[PDB]
């Protein structure tokens, strides 16, 4: 009743939750290792993708990256036709929409997925692509995680994933950076935890407060000043250097502030720096 | 020890502290503000009188350069005083100023204020305090007029430190939100549409921070739930998305540089949290 390709982390993590509900579940892996275990719970494992595709209409692609998709599926392109391929990736929007057209030109349906959680979260997922083909396999997808359809463009699901990861990676390194500064001044990562937690948990309040102003392209400085902002970032950079810690991350922050100041935003809200990000 | 206090520095923060003290029965002398006089404060015309008025002096200044400008010409009269510096400068400037004050005979306490002026006089609020234990305990009660107190230790720099590293995270994290929003908007998705996802992502960080804390704390970075190598590839995807949107790449490429130094140093198979050694220059010779 479903097929999983890419018996890696999420791969098995998905295949497990499928056999736990009663679908004829086939499987297959790139390196072509046997990965026996799940074969003992209702899983056929074909000797090529030719059959693993002709097994069911639904197919879930959990590959390392999109390049690997073309490699294994090109041999069987004559059988992609009439299938619905759910492509769960971590790649850029352009790669997703390149992939979707490739699959559409073989006669297949497609859904682009952006998984929001580690395989342990097998909880929401981004989905984009043709509306009708998503609604038709909605229930089946809701087994893996919650579904959050974002629209028609096959790249929307990748895009939403990527801007989450933008924030996650940058905020998490600032936490590692802040922890390096803390340790060099003699406070442990364990003592710092509640303070790093409150800061990160306080950010939604600021986002909710600024969003409507950002939405309107307005940056009044009634509650904060870019200038005070900048002075404050300068204190962070000097704190870091005095502690003997690498300064490249906070310096990158200071540079965005500096550009805002020189574009005349000193009296505006620091949120005006989004204009600097839009290369104004 | 009567209920009297001096507040030097009368910007939004000093005015609130002074009002909090007035409302709690202190005779309050000030120097920099018509409003606080109408409420019972006494203005000292000069720094010398301000300092002579009381043992306990509260400083709310822009930073420590401001402290020397106004305290230097009155170096005498600093003797048996207890100065509380409630300014937000670096730890090293707080250690310097503590030693400068003690050399003129003044006890000292550093504070880092975690709230806007209007959170002063609410028990919900806290302030970092650091410096010699006994002088802080002898003034604990008075300082709780303004906020709760979180004494952090002897090192006079610790209050400023805790403030600065929460700034480190706040500004870096907020800019990544602005950066992410720009990328969203450039792909036609509004900041209101993005809002829920931006808030969830920031909301879920305490969970990741809690998970990694005992490993980081023990200097251990095993690769059992994440790999640096996979992380750099994810950062790479982010930069490519950012540039396809026409959005400035400064912020995410700085992030990528850190991952690069980590890979270069043989940590491909460690957790990405081993990047904290990169930040400590463990790879750079001492």
């Amino acid at each position: 009743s479903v097929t999983v390709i890419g018996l890696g982390p999420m791969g098995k993590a998905m295949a497990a939750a499928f056999l736990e509900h009663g679908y004829k579940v086939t499987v297959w892996n790139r390196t072509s290792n046997k990965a026996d275990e799940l074969i003992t719970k209702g899983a056929v494992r074909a000797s090529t993708v030719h059959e693993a595709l002709a097994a069911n209409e639904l197919v879930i692609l959990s590959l390392t990256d999109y390049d690997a998709m073309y490699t294994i599926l090109e041999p069987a392109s004559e059988n992609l036709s009439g299938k619905v391929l759910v492509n769960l990736s971590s790649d850029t929007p352009d790669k997703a929409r390149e992939a979707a057209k490739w699959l559409a030109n073989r006669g297949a349906g497609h859904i682009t997925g952006g998984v929001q959680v580690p395989p342990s979260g097998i909880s929401s997922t981004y989905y984009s692509g043709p509306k009708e083909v998503f609604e038709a396999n909605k229930e089946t997808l809701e087994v893996l995680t919650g579904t959050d359809y974002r629209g028609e463009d096959p790249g929307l699901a990748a895009l939403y994933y990527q801007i989450q990861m933008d924030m996650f990676w940058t905020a998490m390194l600032s936490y590692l950076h802040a922890t390096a500064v803390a340790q060099a001044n003699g406070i442990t990562a364990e003592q710092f935890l509640p303070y790093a937690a409150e800061t990160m948990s306080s950010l939604p309040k600021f986002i909710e407060f600024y969003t409507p102003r950002i939405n309107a392209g307005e940056y009044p400085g009634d509650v904060d000043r870019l200038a005070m902002g900048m002075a404050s970032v300068e204190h962070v950079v000097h704190t870091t250097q005095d502690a003997g810690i690498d300064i490249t991350l906070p310096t990158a922050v200071l540079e965005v502030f500096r550009r805002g100041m020189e574009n005349g935003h000193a009296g505006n809200s620091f949120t005006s720096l989004i204009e600097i990000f839009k290369k104004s």
Side-chain angles (χ1 to χ4, degrees), chain A residues 126 159-175 200 203-204 207 211 249 277:
Chain A
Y126 302 117
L159 179 73
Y160 273 91
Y161 178 80
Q162 295 297 345
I163 64 182
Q164 276 187 349
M165 293 320 263
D166 192 7
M167 282 173 300
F168 173 90
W169 287 124
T170 305
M172 279 310 296
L173 267 68
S174 85
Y175 157 75
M200 297 298 96
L203 301 186
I207 293 172
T211 283
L249 184 55
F277 288 136

Side-chain angles (χ1 to χ4, degrees), chain A residues 8 13 31 53 60 91 96 99-100 105 132-133 142 153 172 184 192 201 230-231 260 271:
Chain A
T31 50
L53 251 183
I60 310 285
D91 213 339
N105 284 336
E132 188 154 276
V133 57
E142 284 175 326
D153 171 20
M172 279 310 296
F192 180 42
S201 86
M230 182 148 72
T271 51

